[PDB]
C-alpha cells in the first residue's frame, strides 16, 4: 500500500460495450487508493485517460492532446505489481477507431 500513482491526474471513462453500464466509479476508487487524483472532467491538468468503450470525443481528445491513453488492465497491473507500470505497455482499445 503506497501512493505509487501520486503523480497521475486521471480522467476515467470505463463502460460496458453496449453502453448501458458505467464502471468508471470502480476504477476511480482503485486509482485514488494508489494516490492518484481523479478528475471529474477532462481538463488541461489530466495526464491519463483510462478508457474502455467511452465516448469517441474522449478517445480523439486523448490522442490529440497527447495524454497517456490506457486500458483498465493498466490500473489492475499497477495494483497487483505495486508499481507505476509503463503506460506504453497498456494501450487502450477502441473498436471503432
Ligand atoms: Cl463489456
Curated annotation (Swiss-Prot):
Consequence when changing residue 26 to R: In MCPH1; mild phenotype
Span of domain BRCT: 1-92
Subcellular location: Cytoplasm, Cytoskeleton, Microtubule organizing center, Centrosome
Expression sites by tissue: Expressed in fetal brain, liver and kidney.
Subunit structure: Interacts with CDC27 and maybe other components of the APC/C complex. Interacts with histone variant H2AX under DNA damage conditions.
Function: Implicated in chromosome condensation and DNA damage induced cellular responses. May play a role in neurogenesis and regulation of the size of the cerebral cortex.
Domain notes: BRCT domain 1 is required to prevent abnormal chromosome condensation. It binds directly to the SWI-SNF chromatin remodeling complex. BRCT domains 2 and 3 recognize phosphoserine/phosphothreonine marks on proteins with high selectivity, and mediate interaction with phosphorylated CDC27. They also mediate the dual recognition of phosphoserine and phosphotyrosine in the C-terminal tail of histone H2AX.
Miscellaneous: MCPH1 deficient cells exhibit a delay in post-mitotic chromosome decondensation.
Disease affiliated with this protein: Microcephaly 1, primary, autosomal recessive: A disease defined as a head circumference more than 3 standard deviations below the age-related mean. Brain weight is markedly reduced and the cerebral cortex is disproportionately small. Despite this marked reduction in size, the gyral pattern is relatively well preserved, with no major abnormality in cortical architecture. Affected individuals have mild to severe intellectual disability. Primary microcephaly is further defined by the absence of other syndromic features or significant neurological deficits due to degenerative brain disorder.
Protein's UniProt name: Microcephalin
Amino acid at each position: 500500500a503506497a501512493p505509487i500513482l501520486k503523480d497521475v491526474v486521471a480522467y476515467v471513462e470505463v463502460w460496458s460495450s453496449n453502453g448501458t453500464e458505467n464502471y468508471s466509479k470502480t476504477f476511480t476508487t482503485q486509482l485514488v487508493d494508489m494516490g492518484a487524483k481523479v478528475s471529474k472532467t477532462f481538463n488541461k491538468q489530466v495526464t491519463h485517460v483510462i478508457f474502455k468503450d467511452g465516448y469517441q470525443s474522449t478517445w480523439d481528445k486523448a490522442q490529440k492532446r497527447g495524454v497517456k491513453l490506457v486500458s483498465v488492465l493498466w490500473v489492475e497491473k499497477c495494483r497487483t505489481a505495486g508499481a507505476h507500470i509503463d503506460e506504453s505497455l497498456f494501450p487502450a482499445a477502441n473498436m471503432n477507431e
